[PDB]
Design an enzyme around this catalytic site. Structure first.
Site, PDB file in Angstrom:
ATOM      1  N   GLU A  59       0.075   5.399  11.259  1.00 51.89           N
ATOM      2  CA  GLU A  59       1.099   4.781  10.430  1.00 51.89           C
ATOM      3  C   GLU A  59       2.462   4.964  11.087  1.00 51.89           C
ATOM      4  O   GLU A  59       2.593   5.623  12.121  1.00 51.89           O
ATOM      5  CB  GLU A  59       1.082   5.366   9.016  1.00 51.89           C
ATOM      6  CG  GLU A  59      -0.008   4.797   8.150  1.00 51.89           C
ATOM      7  CD  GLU A  59       0.048   3.291   8.073  1.00 51.89           C
ATOM      8  OE1 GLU A  59       0.899   2.767   7.324  1.00 51.89           O
ATOM      9  OE2 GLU A  59      -0.759   2.627   8.756  1.00 51.89           O
ATOM     10  N   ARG A  60       3.484   4.365  10.480  1.00 50.55           N
ATOM     11  CA  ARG A  60       4.829   4.435  11.032  1.00 50.55           C
ATOM     12  C   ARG A  60       5.367   5.858  10.965  1.00 50.55           C
ATOM     13  O   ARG A  60       5.199   6.555   9.963  1.00 50.55           O
ATOM     14  CB  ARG A  60       5.763   3.494  10.278  1.00 50.55           C
ATOM     15  CG  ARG A  60       5.241   2.086  10.101  1.00 50.55           C
ATOM     16  CD  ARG A  60       6.276   1.228   9.411  1.00 50.55           C
ATOM     17  NE  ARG A  60       5.837  -0.147   9.217  1.00 50.55           N
ATOM     18  CZ  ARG A  60       5.127  -0.567   8.180  1.00 50.55           C
ATOM     19  NH1 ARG A  60       4.712   0.269   7.246  1.00 50.55           N
ATOM     20  NH2 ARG A  60       4.830  -1.858   8.077  1.00 50.55           N
ATOM     21  N   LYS A  94       0.823  -1.207   0.000  1.00 57.02           N
ATOM     22  CA  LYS A  94       0.000   0.000   0.000  1.00 57.02           C
ATOM     23  C   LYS A  94       0.858   1.258   0.000  1.00 57.02           C
ATOM     24  O   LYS A  94       0.566   2.218  -0.723  1.00 57.02           O
ATOM     25  CB  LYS A  94      -0.933   0.004   1.209  1.00 57.02           C
ATOM     26  CG  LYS A  94      -2.003  -1.059   1.183  1.00 57.02           C
ATOM     27  CD  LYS A  94      -3.033  -0.809   2.261  1.00 57.02           C
ATOM     28  CE  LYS A  94      -2.441  -0.968   3.645  1.00 57.02           C
ATOM     29  NZ  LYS A  94      -1.866  -2.320   3.862  1.00 57.02           N
TER      30      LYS A  94
HETATM   31  N1  LIG Z   1       5.640  -1.915  -6.274  1.00 54.35           N
HETATM   32  C1  LIG Z   1       6.506  -2.731  -5.631  1.00 54.35           C
HETATM   33  N2  LIG Z   1       7.580  -3.252  -6.258  1.00 54.35           N
HETATM   34  C2  LIG Z   1       8.443  -4.063  -5.619  1.00 54.35           C
HETATM   35  N3  LIG Z   1       8.320  -4.422  -4.330  1.00 54.35           N
HETATM   36  C3  LIG Z   1       7.286  -3.973  -3.581  1.00 54.35           C
HETATM   37  C4  LIG Z   1       6.302  -3.081  -4.209  1.00 54.35           C
HETATM   38  N4  LIG Z   1       5.395  -2.783  -3.266  1.00 54.35           N
HETATM   39  C5  LIG Z   1       5.763  -3.425  -2.133  1.00 54.35           C
HETATM   40  N5  LIG Z   1       6.889  -4.132  -2.318  1.00 54.35           N
HETATM   41  C6  LIG Z   1       7.555  -4.951  -1.280  1.00 54.35           C
HETATM   42  O1  LIG Z   1       6.838  -4.801  -0.055  1.00 54.35           O
HETATM   43  C7  LIG Z   1       7.673  -4.301   0.987  1.00 54.35           C
HETATM   44  C8  LIG Z   1       7.041  -3.059   1.595  1.00 54.35           C
HETATM   45  O2  LIG Z   1       5.665  -3.272   1.893  1.00 54.35           O
HETATM   46  P1  LIG Z   1       4.776  -2.032   2.393  1.00 54.35           P
HETATM   47  O3  LIG Z   1       4.235  -1.335   1.176  1.00 54.35           O
HETATM   48  O4  LIG Z   1       5.587  -1.255   3.396  1.00 54.35           O
HETATM   49  O5  LIG Z   1       3.568  -2.748   3.180  1.00 54.35           O
HETATM   50  P2  LIG Z   1       2.255  -1.953   3.661  1.00 54.35           P
HETATM   51  O6  LIG Z   1       1.151  -2.552   2.832  1.00 54.35           O
HETATM   52  O7  LIG Z   1       2.156  -2.245   5.136  1.00 54.35           O
HETATM   53  O8  LIG Z   1       2.557  -0.514   3.339  1.00 54.35           O
HETATM   54  C9  LIG Z   1       9.015  -3.948   0.376  1.00 54.35           C
HETATM   55  O9  LIG Z   1      10.071  -4.641   1.038  1.00 54.35           O
HETATM   56  C10 LIG Z   1       8.951  -4.406  -1.060  1.00 54.35           C
HETATM   57  O10 LIG Z   1       9.907  -5.448  -1.269  1.00 54.35           O
HETATM   58 MG   LIG Z   2      -0.868   2.261   4.626  1.00 53.26          MG
END
Ligand SMILES: Nc1ncnc2c1ncn2[C@@H]1O[C@H](COP(=O)(O)OP(=O)(O)O)[C@@H](O)[C@H]1O
Ligand SMILES: [Mg+2]
Ligand SMILES: [Mg+2]
Lengths: 78, 471, 548, 79
Positions: free
Chosen positions: B190-191, B164
């Protein structure tokens, strides 16, 4: 190689056992000395505690009262 | 000269007793300011928001910060109005608290600036404006199967650790500069390191001086996490309804708002609903979400990220929030586990602008055919799992052959993901996406290996990657 | 308004004292009901409302309190006052009391037995108290008094090398702990404008973690797996490896067995890791209130060093037991349960704790605090309630298989928290591991072209054999990067897979003998040495190697 | 060569372990001495309390009544 390692391990274990036994002997001597010192200090600091008890009672509130308190403390101990 | 008194303290909830016929109205704000009298006391500076009238001159209020140190008997002051927040041009390029106090140590906002109350009713039926225009994002799976509207509400549903935040950052990077108007970012639950990173990224890129930020994050009490989205909402409403501008609104996680409400309602003394939620989930959600509209003066384009607890899409909160959205984007963990990024589900993501008269006639047919082939491939998964690929008809093998290629070509390489993988990142316009999927559906590229389709921008890049692979 | 005196006081003196207290308290008139209690021969003890003014007999007991010139001649005795209450309910570990008028939320109260408690709910004519200790000595009618302090723990450098409980009381029997400072258990986190990005590496000593899932100073990484996957071993090896690095480690054990805690402390003492370690313990037989404050006590102990410019590392051996203790405590207070009977603020319970780990900015001093929470799954289900609660708080995860699972273990902050020498060689290793992992899925029984038959299988098998390790033997980063560089550059391809471990051991011996310039160049530059020299050294070792 | 180096390493580790054991034993002896001194002080304090209580009981309370009244008035003023 294996024989040399086994000999080194055996010598190390013997050294560890000797060190532990020497520590145990020193501990026994220290325990005896501490017990003797505890008894002697018990007597001396018991006299001192009686004197300081007379002093503390006087502070919270001479020689004759101190002697009476010492006699009372001796009777309580007996 | 009207004073209250603290009567009970039960966690985040306080009770105050007033004089007869001097009670504050609901949603008012009260202040406690106490200086220690001896060594068994601390200093107190707190604000409270009225929630209920309980009878016998007593009100029940919610605390905006920690209540440690409160003593039964300390006196309270009624301000006479709800929480008021500074609005205007003085908030552009600044970072704010829930109460509207800057937290970027660049100075103090003057006390004579105009301030607006946090709580207000929604716009009426005789003021809204209905029309559909298309917003371009540069994402293939979003542009093709679920295009965004230029004045509506967009949602990105996701579990934990599925992407997300990365999608939010990519959308910010692509859109916020092209918008050329005003933008507001509100982060709820959020963080804190994510907000610290985003602030510096925006300051480097230069999107600041046309952005205002409000932060209430994971470490804050429920009362603060409840009423932070309303502050950003007020800040955007000022621009829309007073300068006739076009405003963007980003919300970091709208699930935390209902979660904090659920935490508070238990101590407020209410009978729990299903799965332990509050009885007033839908009413609070609607009261928040009906102020984000486009009236006759201006518009508010809102993009929201929604969390799904325990990867259950039938939970009361996601199910309730699904009904307020014009375009939705569902991320699944199974697609992310295969390396497909972004993990958008191509069949459960919808848009109200996918009509033949809005996007065109070629686009509609291409998207429908792609969805049909993906659904047909989805139907054959169990029999492939048990029996295998050797017990299928020729048409079914062709369907699988094209479906794997389509599913791999829906992925992309992002600008903000460069620090993870290394690829620079890609941007694809709509017509190129439609052309590429039209060629894929025609069997033009049926001989290339299925792996050449992963993490590329266009189809010419697919050809180049296949060429460099020795084929 | 009742007085205890040695002798029946004169009515005129009673009237004078009553008038004095009426003037002092704020009442127009006051009447005293004197008693004839003869035990208090020192003087008068007054009890008015819920306040007590002591006599003189207590001074003698106060004399014991002043065990500590000669006590400054019994020092001086003063009329000490206190605010009190009485218990009206007790059971299952939660009490409820009258009195305690001017008590604060979160304060510490003390029972007549000697146990402590928290003031949780201040109701109209009630106080709810959570008992932090054994509750079988508290009965209705007992007396409880205030301390005047919010909850806190003792902090300082005197705690280093000791085993304590969540309140700071030593349990190893080596004597009192002589600290002189305190810190509140519930404290705010650093702000948005107080932090900075993570740019320093934390070396665990394990090749698989140090190459595939790097960790930086100031990060929050989660270690997740089933029971009997051995995460305590990972924690112990990581703590042991910080001998040379200027790091302070804190180990918190929640819900474990005291025998295993004893053996873990013995393991730490052998390797000389008690010069920079603090251990906080709350075993499985302790009350739920104590099982729930332990992580907060640990973080409070760590922040004292963190806010001075030092670097700290904290391990929570199980958050899934803190969660169960909190659910038990909250269900006894009759709060509506949610999913899996967990309360509504079970996310807040963990998010407020793991947000205190940060990499501070240079205006604040530059300290740091790394965190390593543990979570235990059932049948490897990573989509449960608590695992997903904690996955959405941290900066990555390490999934242990019932052996790191690289398909689910990731690190966000890491990558910038790596040295250049390892960053140059990690990519090829990751690609080879992936190649083998997907190839073996179908090539278990099937012929392949020579490319996929050797380059996609033998290289992966050799790297899987290289990634193994042994207990309590951490490896320096220079040796790690050298062996990984050799494997990725192409040696070992003519070495049998049954001899790679011995090859690596003999390579380390050869390095320690005649590779001083290589090792010093790496340690001083954080970059790879000259390729020609590295190849020459590797060729010399291969020539001297006796392949079996 | 390598075997002799391993033997020397084992010997050094055993020597370090023995030295740690010796330091632990010395610290245990010091702790025992400190505990013994503390216990002696505790016994002295208990005896002092008992004797002071007996002496104060023997003391005349005729003036102690006035002293208690004056101290109560002083404490009333102070609080
Ligand atoms: N568009 C993307 N391309 C490559 N890796 C991704 C992508 N989106 C998320 N990731 C993977 O997901 C991890 C981060 O997830 P994150 O987005 O922080 O989770 P949340 O849904 O809690 O925000 C990263 O380590 C990455 O490897
Ligand atoms: Mg979020
Ligand atoms: Mg464990």
């Amino acid at each position: 190689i294996e024989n040399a390692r086994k000999l080194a391990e055996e010598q190390k274990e013997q050294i560890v056992a000797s060190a532990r036994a020497e520590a145990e002997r020193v501990k026994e001597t220290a325990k005896k000395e501490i017990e003797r010192e505890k008894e002697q200090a018990m007597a001396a600091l018991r006299e001192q505690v009686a004197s300081l008890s007379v002093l503390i009672a006087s502070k919270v509130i001479x020689x004759x009262x101190x002697x009476x308190x010492x006699x009372x403390x001796x009777x309580x101990x007996x | 000269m009207t004073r209250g008194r603290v009567i009970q303290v039960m966690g985040p909830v306080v009770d105050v007793k007033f004089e007869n016929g001097h009670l504050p109205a609901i949603y008012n704000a009260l202040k406690i300011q106490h200086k220690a009298r001896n060594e068994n006391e601390v200093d107190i500076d707190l604000t409270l928001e009225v929630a209920l009238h309980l009878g016998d001159d007593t009100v029940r209020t919610i605390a905006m910060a920690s209540t440690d140190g409160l003593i039964r008997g300390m006196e309270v002051i009624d301000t006479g109005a709800p929480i008021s927040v500074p609005v205007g041009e003085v908030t552009l390029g600044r970072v704010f608290n829930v109460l509207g106090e800057p937290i970027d140590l660049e100075g103090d906002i003057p006390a004579d600036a105009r301030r607006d109350p946090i709580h207000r009713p929604a716009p009426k039926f005789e003021e809204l404006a209905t029309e559909v225009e298309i917003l371009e994002t540069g994402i293939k799976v979003v542009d093709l199967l679920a295009p965004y509207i230029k004045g509506g509400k967009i949602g990105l549903f996701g579990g934990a650790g599925v992407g997300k935040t990365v999608l939010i950052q990519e959308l910010i990077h692509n859109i916020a500069q092209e918008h050329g108007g005003i933008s507001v970012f509100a982060g709820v639950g959020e963080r804190t390191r994510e907000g610290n990173d985003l602030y510096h990224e925006m300051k480097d890129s230069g999107v600041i001086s046309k952005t205002a930020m409000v932060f209430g994050q994971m470490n804050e009490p429920p009362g603060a996490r409840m009423r932070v989205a309303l502050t950003g909402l007020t800040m955007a409403e000022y621009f829309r309804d007073e300068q006739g501008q076009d405003v963007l609104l980003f919300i970091d996680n709208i699930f935390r708002f209902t979660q904090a409400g659920s935490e508070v309602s238990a101590l407020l003394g209410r009978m729990p609903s299903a799965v332990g939620y509050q009885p007033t989930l839908a009413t609070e959600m609607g009261q928040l979400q009906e102020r984000i509209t486009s009236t006759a003066k201006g518009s508010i384009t809102s993009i929201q990220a929604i969390y799904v607890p325990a990867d259950d899409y039938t939970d009361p909160a996601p199910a309730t929030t699904f009904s307020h959205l014009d375009a939705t984007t569902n991320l699944e963990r199974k697609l992310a586990e295969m390396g497909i990024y972004p993990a958008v589900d191509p069949l459960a993501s919808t848009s109200r602008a996918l009509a033949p008269e809005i996007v065109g006639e070629e686009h509609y047919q291409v998207a429908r055919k792609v969805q049909q082939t993906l659904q047909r491939y989805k139907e054959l998964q169990d029999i492939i799992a048990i029996l295998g690929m050797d017990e299928l008809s020729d048409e079914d093998k062709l369907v699988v052959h094209r479906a794997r290629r389509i599913q791999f070509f829906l992925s992309q390489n992002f600008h903000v993901a460069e620090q993870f993988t290394g690829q620079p990142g890609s941007y694809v316009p709509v017509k190129e996406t439609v052309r590429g999927f039209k060629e894929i559906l025609e069997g033009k590229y049926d001989h290339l290996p299925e792996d050449a389709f992963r993490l590329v921008g266009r189809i010419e890049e697919v050809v180049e990657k296949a060429k460099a692979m020795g084929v | 308004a009742v007085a205890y005196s040695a002798r029946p006081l004169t009515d005129e003196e009673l009237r004078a004292l009553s008038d004095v207290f009426a003037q002092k308290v704020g009442k127009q008139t006051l009447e005293i009901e004197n008693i004839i209690d003869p035990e208090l021969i020192g003087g008068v003890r007054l009890r008015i409302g819920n306040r007590i003014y002591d006599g003189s007999v207590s001074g003698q007991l106060e004399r014991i309190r002043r065990q500590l010139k000669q006590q400054i001649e019994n020092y001086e005795s003063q009329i000490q006052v206190s605010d009190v209450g009485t218990v009206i309910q007790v059971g299952d570990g939660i009490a409820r009391a009258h009195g305690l008028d001017n008590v604060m939320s979160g304060e510490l109260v003390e029972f007549a037995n000697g146990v402590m408690g928290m003031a949780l709910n201040l109701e109209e004519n009630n106080v709810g108290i959570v008992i932090l200790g054994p509750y079988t000595g508290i009965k209705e009618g007992d007396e409880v008094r205030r301390t005047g302090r919010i909850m806190e723990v003792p902090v300082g450098e005197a705690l280093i090398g000791r085993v304590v409980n969540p309140l700071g009381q030593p349990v190893d029997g080596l004597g009192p702990v002589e600290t002189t400072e305190t810190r509140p258990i519930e404290s705010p986190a650093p702000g948005v404008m107080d932090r900075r990005s993570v740019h320093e590496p934390l070396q665990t000593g394990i090749k698989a973690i140090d190459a595939l899932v790097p960790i930086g100073r100031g990060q929050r990484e989660l270690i997740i797996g089933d029971r009997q996957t051995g995460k305590t071993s990972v924690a112990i090896d990581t703590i042991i490896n910080q001998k040379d690095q200027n790091m302070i480690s804190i180990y918190v054990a929640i819900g474990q067995k005291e025998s295993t805690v004893r053996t873990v402390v013995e393991t730490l003492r052998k390797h000389g890791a008690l010069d920079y370690t603090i251990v906080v313990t709350a075993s499985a037989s302790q009350p739920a209130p104590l099982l729930f404050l332990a992580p907060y006590a640990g973080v409070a102990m760590g922040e004292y060093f963190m806010y001075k410019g030092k670097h700290v590392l904290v391990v929570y051996d199980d958050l899934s037991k803190q969660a169960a203790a909190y659910r038990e405590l909250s269900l006894l207070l009759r709060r509506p349960p949610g999913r899996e009977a967990y309360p509504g603020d079970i996310f807040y319970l963990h998010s407020r704790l793991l947000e205190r780990a940060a990499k501070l900015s240079d205006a604040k001093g530059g300290g740091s605090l790394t965190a390593l929470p543990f979570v235990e799954t059932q049948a490897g289900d990573i989509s449960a309630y608590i695992p997903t609660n904690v996955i959405s708080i941290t900066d990555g995860q390490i999934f242990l298989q019932s052996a790191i699972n690289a398909g689910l273990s990731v690190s966000r902050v890491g990558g910038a928290a790596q040295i250049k020498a390892m960053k140059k060689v990690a990519g090829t290793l990751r690609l080879d591991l992936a190649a083998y992992r997907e190839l073996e899925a179908f090539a278990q029984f099937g012929s392949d072209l020579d490319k996929a038959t050797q380059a996609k299988l033998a290289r992966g098998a050799r790297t899987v054999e290289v990634l193994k390790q042994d207990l309590h033997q951490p490896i320096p980063v220079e040796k790690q990067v050298l062996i990984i560089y050799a494997l990725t550059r192409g040696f070992l391809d003519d070495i049998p897979v049954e001899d790679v471990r011995r090859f690596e051991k003999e390579f380390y011996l050869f390095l320690d003998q005649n590779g001083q310039h290589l090792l010093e160049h790496i340690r001083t530059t954080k970059d790879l040495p000259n390729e020609d020299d590295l190849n020459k050294a590797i060729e010399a070792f291969k020539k001297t190697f006796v392949v079996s």
